[PDB]
Design a protein around this ligand. Structure first.
Ligand SMILES: OC[C@H]1O[C@H](O[C@H]2[C@H](O)[C@@H](O)[C@@H](O[C@H]3[C@H](O)[C@@H](O)[C@H](O)O[C@@H]3CO)O[C@@H]2CO)[C@H](O)[C@@H](O)[C@@H]1O
Ligand SMILES: [Ca+2]
Ligand code: NA
Length: 763
């Protein structure tokens, strides 16, 4: 909750080590050629460093042998030691594994006889064997897949033009119904599989083909650096999010087809990224420099008590709530983090980063990292959690001698406006407190939550409620992520409308409303992968090590909630057509007219946005109605009185859904209206290229609807599958179908009617 500046023996010692031994060299770890291989280790605390060579990454493998051990020597600049140990092995050392045996004091007993010896993999490992205990010497060119030389970054012109899909690699394709091959389900190489369909029946698209259709700009991948919590030699049914770092610069083994050979995971990890780039998707990497799984790490075994934040009592500061904190303010951890980021960008073609507990990382380091990545390309995205997971004890100043500031929401002003911050303001505003699955926000009917949404609409960059972003560029707009409950699960829990993962019409209405808010709000639009298909975790509010089949994306939901997918798909189009919504800066802040005060307690939020981009819509009107009844909303902005509706309770997109004359709109219960000026709609010529299918549910005898009709919307020639309504009482059964239950989208709207008759459920 709090951070404390406390200077002590540990911090002063570490600061002295930086002053004398800070090494800006580029070459720590292994420098490989066919002719020789050089090893470098930074450890001013050591009295000796020994290199151990092996044939295999573990002793259980066929051919496993200790080759030899060698003595590293102190590296001398003049006649002076720079803190670096080095040796050069002459010959071909490709595909050998190694550890270091480091004999070392701690930071507060340098030059003393109080040493211990630790065996460790390289701090600067670029490859490891199974479970990351032994590093591997590799020619990185050999790990490049076919086409890798032609693979470019996929970068957004502006971060605020993004639509982010937060995905776990196992979740993506562990489901058998994903249509991914037995070999590749839950693995890096699932992303390379094109033409995948539900149950491989060839009717409706899944996985990579689904993402192309959905139109997400960005996939954010949950930890795919090497973590501790999956035994890579164990069973395929294991699951962890992987916020348990062991090797920061090595891919996770369990997502590969072979973790024993250290080259395989690298190649396959690159194939995943290439595949996403080929589909025109940007790749954002979840990174966790804020803590390591344990202090029995390569860092601590190489330079004890340097790389972690130390309290005066000798205890490790526990700001992460996982046991330790990485000391970003230290010269050589700062350098490690920035070099690591550059490595993932250059070597793996990563396009941006999501920083776990960014509130533990110091502002100066984050700003230097932003600067470093700008040298590559400023379009490289950065965002993080502007909070910590416990009390943080740090030195007063950084290694540069500037005051320490944590990169929290409170210090947004001190942070680059292109290091964005998760907006828990709009998160809690939309669906209720993330700390309480049963708590209600705006979509469930909270009037007091309205202000959270209203401040969220301008990315908490206009006025101050809870926290203030510098600009929309500094704000991630979201209602749910991997943490806590899924949107749909919180809707279900807070209302009691149904069981977890069961379709309910009112629940789905609330889900559509949340969609409307996210994509008519400024900042970087962000969803949990499958939010658009009503993803459930069966009520699990912390699924980090829960069952694999619980966590996995249920691909059947692309059919069961096809209409909801279609709604998101359409809302995404609206945001990307109307420039004020994807603004990086504050230039549109004074162009909003809210009908009520932003801080108002209300069932209906409405606002207009004046645009200034030629060839776009001139003005947009947006209305959220969380009431259980229809509401007539009259805009305070009466400058436009001819409107074209482009999203309602039924559908969203770029096509006209009907017109409104005047300043008053009828908004159905628990739904949104998005309208644009008539003149602008005509002149801009913005229109949908997507086909539509309308699904009706009719009592055959009378012709009355048993349930509201729904709208599917997708690319022309792409496959769709409709189903009978899941919510219709069990005393009705489908007697016949009119139209094509399944087929392909056309330019013309197609209709399917499920005709119902009287039924009594049997034994
Ligand atoms: O044994 C290791 C620790 O395991 C447990 O911590 C879990 C969390 O319960 C889990 O929610 C997840 O937290 C991370 C969160 O999902 C992510 O968004 C954020 O950026 O970082 C969080 C970690 O700081 O993962 C951790 C670690 O696996 C347990 O609660 C903890 O006490 C144990 O030390
Ligand atoms: Ca691992
Ligand atoms: Na598999």
């Amino acid at each position: 909750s709090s951070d404390y500046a406390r200077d002590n023996s540990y911090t002063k010692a570490a600061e002295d080590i930086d002053a004398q031994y800070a090494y800006s060299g580029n070459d720590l770890g292994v420098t490989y050629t066919k002719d020789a291989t050089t090893f470098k280790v930074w450890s001013p605390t050591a009295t000796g460093v020994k290199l151990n060579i092996f044939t295999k990454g573990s002793d259980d493998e066929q051919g496993a042998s200790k080759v030899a051990s060698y003595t590293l020597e102190k590296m001398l600049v003049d006649g002076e030691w720079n803190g670096v140990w080095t040796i050069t092995l002459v010959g071909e050392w490709k595909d050998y594994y190694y550890t270091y045996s480091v004999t070392t004091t701690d930071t507060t007993h340098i030059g003393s006889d109080a040493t211990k010896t630790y065996e460790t993999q390289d701090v600067y490992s670029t490859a490891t064997g199974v479970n990351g205990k032994r590093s591997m010497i590799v020619d990185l060119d050999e790990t490049d897949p076919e086409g890798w030389s032609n693979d470019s970054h996929v970068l957004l012109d502006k971060s605020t033009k993004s639509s982010v899909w937060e995905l776990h690699i196992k979740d993506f394709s562990y489901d058998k119904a994903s249509g991914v091959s037995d070999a590749n389900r839950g693995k890096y190489l699932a992303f390379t599989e094109n033409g995948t369909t539900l149950n491989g029946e060839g009717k409706v698209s899944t996985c990579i083909d689904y993402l192309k259709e959905l139109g997400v700009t960005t996939v954010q991948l949950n930890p795919f650096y090497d973590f501790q919590s999956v035994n890579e030699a164990g069973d395929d049914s294991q699951f962890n999010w992987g916020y348990d770092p062991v090797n920061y610069n090595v891919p996770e083994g369990s997502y590969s087809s072979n973790p024993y050979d250290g080259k395989v995971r690298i190649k396959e990890c690159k194939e995943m990224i290439k595949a996403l780039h080929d589909a025109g998707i940007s790749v954002v990497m979840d990174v966790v420099y804020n803590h390591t799984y344990s202090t029995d790490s390569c860092f601590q075994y190489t330079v004890p008590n340097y790389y972690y934040r130390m309290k005066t009592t000798g205890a490790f500061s526990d700001g992460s709530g996982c046991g330790n904190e990485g000391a970003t303010e230290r010269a050589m951890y700062r350098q490690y983090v920035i070099d690591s980021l550059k490595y993932w960008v250059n070597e793996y073609h990563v396009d941006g980063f999501r920083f776990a507990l960014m509130g533990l990382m110091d502002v100066e380091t984050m700003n230097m990292a932003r600067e470093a990545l700008d040298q590559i390309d400023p379009r490289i995205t950065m965002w993080g959690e502007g909070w910590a997971g416990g009390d943080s004890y740090h030195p007063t100043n950084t290694c540069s001698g500037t005051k320490f500031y944590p990169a929290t929401q409170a210090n947004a002003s001190r942070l680059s406006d292109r290091i964005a911050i998760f907006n828990d303001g709009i998160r809690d505003g939309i669906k209720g407190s993330a700390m309480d699955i049963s708590d209600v926000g705006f979509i469930q009917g909270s009037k007091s939550s309205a202000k959270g949404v209203s401040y969220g609409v301008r990315a908490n960059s206009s006025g101050t409620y809870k926290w203030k972003a510098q600009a929309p560029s500094q704000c991630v707009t979201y209602d749910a992520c991997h943490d806590n409950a899924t949107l749909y699960d919180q809707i279900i829990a807070s209302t009691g409308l149904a069981d977890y993962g069961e379709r309910n019409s009112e629940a789905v209405k609330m889900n559509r409303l949340a969609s409307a808010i996210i994509y008519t709000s400024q900042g970087i639009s962000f969803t949990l992968a499958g939010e658009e298909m009503a993803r459930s975790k069966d009520g699990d509010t912390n699924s980090y090590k829960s069952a694999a089949n619980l966590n996995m994306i249920k691909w059947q939901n692309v059919v069961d909630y096809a209409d909801v997918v279609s709604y998101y798909k359409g809302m995404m189009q609206i945001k990307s057509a109307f420039s004020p919504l994807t603004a990086m800066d504050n230039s549109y802040a004074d162009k909003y007219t809210f009908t009520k005060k932003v801080s108002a307690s209300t069932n209906q939020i409405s606002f207009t946005i004046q645009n200034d981009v030629e060839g776009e819509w001139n003005k947009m009107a947006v209305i959220y109605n969380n009431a259980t009844t229809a509401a007539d909303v009259t805009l305070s902005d009466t400058s436009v009185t001819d409107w074209v509706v482009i999203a309602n309770g039924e559908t969203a997109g770029l096509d006209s859904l009907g017109e409104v004359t005047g300043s008053t709109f009828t908004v159905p219960a628990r739904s949104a209206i998005v309208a644009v000026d008539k003149a602008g709609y005509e002149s801009a010529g913005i229109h949908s290229s997507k086909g539509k299918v309308k699904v009706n549910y009719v009592y055959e005898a009378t012709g009355e609807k048993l349930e509201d009709s729904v709208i599917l919307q997708g690319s022309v020639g792409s496959g769709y599958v409709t189903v009978p309504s899941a919510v219709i009482p069990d005393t009705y059964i489908v007697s016949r179908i009119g139209g094509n239950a399944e087929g392909k989208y056309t330019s013309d709207m197609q209709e399917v009617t499920y005709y119902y008759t009287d039924y009594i459920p049997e034994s």
